[PDB]
Every structure is written in C-alpha cells, then in structure tokens.
Amino acid sequence: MLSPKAATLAERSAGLAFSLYQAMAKDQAVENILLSPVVVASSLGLVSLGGKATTASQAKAVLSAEQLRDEEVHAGLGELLRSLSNVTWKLGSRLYGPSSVSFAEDFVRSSKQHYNCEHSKINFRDKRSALQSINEWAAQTTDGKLPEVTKDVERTDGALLVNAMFFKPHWDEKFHHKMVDNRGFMVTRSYTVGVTMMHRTGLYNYYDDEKEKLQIVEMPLAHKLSSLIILMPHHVEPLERLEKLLTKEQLKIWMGKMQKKAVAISLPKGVVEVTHDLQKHLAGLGLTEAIDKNKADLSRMSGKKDLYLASVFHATAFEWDTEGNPFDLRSPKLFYADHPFIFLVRDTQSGSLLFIGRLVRPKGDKM
Amino acid sequence: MLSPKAATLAERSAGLAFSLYQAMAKDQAVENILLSPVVVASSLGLVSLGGKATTASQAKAVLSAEQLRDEEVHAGLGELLRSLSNVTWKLGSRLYGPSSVSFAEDFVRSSKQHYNCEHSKINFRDKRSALQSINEWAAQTTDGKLPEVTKDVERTDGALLVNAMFFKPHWDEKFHHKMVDNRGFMVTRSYTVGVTMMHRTGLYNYYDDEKEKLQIVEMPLAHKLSSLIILMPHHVEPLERLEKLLTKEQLKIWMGKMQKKAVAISLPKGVVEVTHDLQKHLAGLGLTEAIDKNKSDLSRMSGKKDLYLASVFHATAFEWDTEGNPRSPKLFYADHPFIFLVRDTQSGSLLFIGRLVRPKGDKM
C-alpha cells in the first residue's frame, strides 16, 4: 500500500494526466494518445530536482506539492514509480545533454535513486548518430517493441528527457489463442483499416448509457490487482463529444452504474506505438521557465545555467494480446471495438491511474 | 463433352436467354425471372419442328439459328438437354392441345426424340380440372417443389407447352446448418419482406467494380462441375441500371477481373417458385405468327391449321439451401435484388439466368 504522501501525489498525477490528455485531444494533428500519469509526474520531479528558483518552484506547483519538502516530493514520486512494478511492463528514463555540458554528481546520484534516471551526452553536430542512439536506447529498453522514438529532434541545444515504455495488459481471464481473426477498424465513417481482432465472451462489469450513447466495460487484469476500462460511443464519431464528458466525477458515476453481464468483447490485437513530446503542453500547465532557454535555471543538474528543457519524449508501445491467466453467457451484449475508443488502466487497491489513452487509428492499411 | 454443333447451339441459347431476360426485365409486371436457356431454345425448336413457312422461319430467327439446317438445330438442342442430366435437377416438357385435335405421328416421334416432349389432350373449358391436372403433373415431375404452374390459362382454343423444373444448387463448400437467421429483404426502398438468410465466409472468386458500383461472386457447385454467379449493385436500387450493363461481353470482362478473396456471402434461404408465360416476350423478339390464331401455321403438328401457340409456360422451383459437400472478408449481403447465373464449368454453357427481386415472405 502507498504512503499517504505518495497517495496524494498519485491523485495529482491522475489529474495532471487528464489535463494533458485533454490538451492533446484538442490538437487535430494528434491521433492516438498514451500517457502514464506517474511517468509524467516523475518528469516534473526531475525538473524540481535539477532546477533552482522559479524553474523548480513551477515544477512543484504543477505537481501541487509546493507545501512539501523537496525530499518528500522525490521520495513520494520514487515510491509511485516503484509501485508500477506489480516482462509485461518496461520503463527507461534517460537525460540527454549536449557534449559540452557535465552532469553534477549529486544530481546524477539523486536522479538514479528516486527516478531511476540514466544520463547520456548527445552530439547533434552528427544528427544521424544522435537520433540513432536515442532510438536504439528505446529499442533495447522495450526489446524492439518501440523501434523509434522520433524521426527528428526540433530543439538540439538543450536537455532531452526520454521515457521509453512497453506495457502489455495481462488479463485475469485470458482470450483463447485461436479467437483471433482479420477485421476492418473504422477510423472514420469513410475510412477503414485492416486489423487483427481478438475475441472473448465472459462476465464483465458493463454499462450502456442510452442517454449519452456510449458503452463502458471493465476488464480485470491479473489477480484483479488492476483493471482496464474501455469507453466507446455507440456510433463511429470523433472522440471530442465523449472527451467533453470524461471527468474524474463522470467516471465515478459510470462505474457505480456498471454491473456484471455476459459481454462479447472484440478488440484490435497488436502493438500501438505512441510518441508524444510533452514540452509544449507542460508549459501550458505552469512549467514555463524550464522550457525557455533565456529563463531556465537547471543549475543543480549541470552546475551552470547552460541547460533548458528542450523536450520530454513520452514514448509507449501498448500491446493488446490474448495472454492472461488460465482462470476461465447465452446472449452477450456486444462490445465490438472496431471504432475509436478511450481506455484507462486503474490500480484496484489505490484507484491510482496507471494509464490514460485513446486508440483512434491502429496500424494497418486502408480499404 | 458437347459436339461442336451442340456447343454452337448452346452459344445461341445463351444469347437468346440474354435477349429474353432483357425483354422481361423491361416489363413492369415482371418481378422474379428464372430462365433455363436450353429449355427456352428447345421451345423455339418445337415451333420450328411443328410450324412451317413464316411461323417456323421466325422461330429459327429468334434463336439466331437461321444459318443452320433444321436437323442441326433439333439434334444439337437434344444433346444439350441430355448433357444437363448429371446437384438436384428435375425437368418435364409437355404439350397440351385441345382434346378434339390430333397430334401427328411424325411430329410426336420427333418432339419425344429431341425435346422429350410428352403429349396430352385436355379439355381447357374444364378450367379447375384442367389446371388441377397440369399442376399435379408439375408437382409429380418436381416431387412437390413446384406445386403450381399457373393460377389461370386464358386460351382454351390453342396449344400449350409446359416446362416444369426443380433446381437445387449443391455447394462445393456447404453452409453451416446453424448459420441461418431471420432478416429483412428490401424489395424496394419503401418495402421490406421478412426472409430467412443463410451465411458463410470462404474463398470465392470475387469482383467489386468501384466505377459501376456492383459486386460479382462465383460460388462453385459440387465438384466444381458448374458454378453459381451473383451480380448485385452495392446499394439498394432497382436492377434497371445493372441490366443495361449486362451483356455476354461485359460478363466475360467481369469474370476475367475476378480473383479468389475472403467473402462473407449472405443469401436468402428457401424455394423460389417462378412461372413465366414466355408467349408475349418471344412475340416481341420476332415470334409473331405462331402466337396468332389467324396467322399460325402449326400444320406439321396437327396436319391442319387448327392450332396456334396459346402459351409457353416456363415454370421453375429454385431452392437456396445450406447443403453441399463438407484476410478480412468482403460482404456479399444479398438483402436486395440481384441477378444470378448457373454456368457449366467444362462447356461455359449457361444453365440458368435469372433475378430475385421479391422472395417469399410477409411485409414488415
């Protein structure tokens, strides 16, 4: 069980991830979203850790932890990251600084300790090798499930925070290995993509909102320690309408309305790869000084004001697979996910949000 | 294998059936169409056989066999009728003339030889009993699958040729017996009928014409000896537009464009009973003299000008059933009118041409 301080940070981490999701969902350039609240919060913790004055105070303020000691922040976030570990979960965090810069010992030790932070130098004078090394580090961290973070780095003169993840929900009741076929996923009413779908009928917590024209299903993960929640509108439509409805309170209402029913869950099968640069969105949440070359004070990090937060790459490979525990209906309700949906990974014990995302366009070709 | 003469007759029989189909499709009174090219050709053959002068020349001209000798047309249509016999298939040809008239020995011998045409004298003024006996003959011929030919016969004074058929395509890959449910078939955009549909996903020869907004599927029959071809527009629309496109040449183009793809075929299940009186339509194709009491010269039939062709009943019971031998699919969902063909694999010979516009069922 989480300590009271880690628990409060977790609540803010969730709220922050909802704000980040909403910010990104408003961008018409953004298709799929994948956010780990904890990893997003740990990134602000590094800014507090490495920074001074306003640069650091903003990070604590975004984290709503301004009344806590710096040690309490780092310890709590450290505890939350540690709590994500409970094969099917892989995380790596690396800070890339220019060749010229030198990371400070104290920072290097603290970041290793609380945030499991790896440190590297990067030379963008040879851009190919610079990209190659980031992408390879991510490939190795996720054992090839995330083969590329970015095709290009916009800002080359600062610090680069890269988080590389691989998550594979392991079901409490597995899908049959043969319950897999090729279907069409409707990205829009006029655009279909060829996907692999996996299928299972079982008793699931389910709710059909006839008023808001949406379905909600809860899929318990291994040993009911966490669960995957799927929110999908009845019709193929842009997620904008549903996203407006999505709040911590609305989710509580929907979940109370759920009941154990026979449900034929059909989901796309495969790895969804998402890379976000959180840089612009975090600045919108109050982290203004850290991302500005002229105002950034990351001097606890390097010893000098020779650094700014150029990027915060949140890169995830989320795998939808048949695997789960062996542990396991005449007229089921269909939860046929062949159109965009919103999903959440919730920790059962804490209520702590592990993932927030949406699948709008899976891998495949047009038809 | 067909003789070269039978093969050329078969090509004319197909072309004739295309002309007949087109003629009928233009008629607003016509709903479902079911034609056996061979049996249709065999009917013109009997008019050539029993009629003389213009009455016979028209019959050959309709069939587009005017450049052939009379014996070539009769012998070759006989071989075609014979080759068909080998899937469930039942045929009966029968000549009904008035009880007073006399069938000529020479014609009786030739009609039974080539066309297997049994002859029967009947009182047509005796309506209920007349109908009862024709409809019973058809019921027995088809083993009750076609219980009725017609509800009425308008011309008591002339000759009646009746063809009674039962055809049941037996699939090379059967439908699962439980893959059957109740759906709605859209006869029009304002009219839906409750039907039973049968469903199967498999590899089928398929073509989707994006330009002409239509789908074409080939469903092989038992041992790939023949196949059932389905032509349907993408959306619910009367078949008129598709029918304009339908030609022997266009069909050849479409079939060459087909390829083996995963197809989810959904078809109405049941027996479709179709009874056509070809009389009016054949007259429109050139067979004018034979159907007219005042111009008909069927003297090779009845030794005198005491006969005319009142009707040519082409009666078929086509059964769509699940029975047959033991990537992301494309939908071929036949819940709206479609055109279909039964083709012989070896010859290319057209066994059936038709369309299902309104299946059995109640309005919903």
């Binding site: 409707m186 009413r189 299928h199 019709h235 193929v236 034929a264 007229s331 089921p332 269909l334 046929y336 062949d338 | 699962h176 439980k178 893959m179 449910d181």
Partner: peptide, 15 residues
C-alpha cells in the same frame, strides 16, 4: 469445433 458465434453488430447508418 464449437457452434458458430453470435451475429455481429448492426452496420452503420447511410449518409
């Protein structure tokens, strides 16, 4: 082999 699965969902509406 088990029995066939249930029917799929109703298709989308027309334009």
């Amino acid at each position: 082999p088990g029995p066939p699965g249930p029917p799929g969902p109703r298709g989308p509406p027309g334009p």
